[PDB]
């Protein structure tokens, strides 16, 4: 669902469409879809 | 629907109607998801003020 979120699309900076790790953390925190402990699990599962 | 967009930024939107906190309720409901500052600008209100 987060791909269609404007509050994360604006945080997307790379022209190729890539989103920085810190920016993607801040996007989750702003959208409040996932809580703090879940943030780390999503970060780990993300393609580092 | 297009015409109703004029009173969004006006400071007299809840006039001639019982409720005067409709903008505040809309802000408190949609700020966390669509951006609190964006909704404040849309409704013509200042959170700091």
Curated annotation (Swiss-Prot), chain A:
Subcellular location: Sarcoplasmic reticulum membrane
Superkingdom of origin: Eukaryota
Post-translational modification: The N-terminus is blocked.
Tissue-specificity statement: Detected in skeletal muscle (at protein level). Fast- or slow-twitch skeletal muscle.
Family the entry assigns: Belongs to the ryanodine receptor (TC 1.A.3.1) family. RYR1 subfamily.
Note: Binding of [3H]ryanodine indicates that the heterozygous channel is activated by Ca(2+) concentrations 4-fold lower than normal. Single-cell analysis of cotransfected cells shows a significantly increased resting cytoplasmic Ca(2+) level and a significantly reduced luminal Ca(2+) level.
Function: Cytosolic calcium-activated calcium channel that mediates the release of Ca(2+) from the sarcoplasmic reticulum into the cytosol and thereby plays a key role in triggering muscle contraction following depolarization of T-tubules. Repeated very high-level exercise increases the open probability of the channel and leads to Ca(2+) leaking into the cytoplasm. Can also mediate the release of Ca(2+) from intracellular stores in neurons, and may thereby promote prolonged Ca(2+) signaling in the brain. Required for normal embryonic development of muscle fibers and skeletal muscle.
Domain notes: The calcium release channel activity resides in the C-terminal region while the remaining part of the protein constitutes the 'foot' structure spanning the junctional gap between the sarcoplasmic reticulum (SR) and the T-tubule. Pore opening is mediated via the cytoplasmic calcium-binding domains that mediate a small rotation of the channel-forming transmembrane regions that then leads to channel opening.
Protein name as catalogued: Ryanodine receptor 1
Organism: Oryctolagus cuniculus
């Amino acid at each position: 669902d987060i791909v269609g979120s404007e509050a994360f699309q604006d945080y997307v900076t790379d022209p190729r469409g890539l989103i920085s790790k810190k920016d993607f953390q801040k996007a989750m925190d702003s959208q409040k879809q996932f809580t703090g402990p879940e943030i780390q699990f999503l970060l780990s599962c993300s393609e580092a | 629907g297009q015409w109703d967009r004029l009173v969004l930024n006006t400071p007299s939107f809840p006039s001639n109607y019982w409720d005067k906190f409709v903008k505040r309720k809309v802000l408190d409901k949609h700020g966390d998801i669509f951006g609190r500052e964006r909704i404040a600008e849309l409704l013509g209100m200042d959170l700091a003020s």
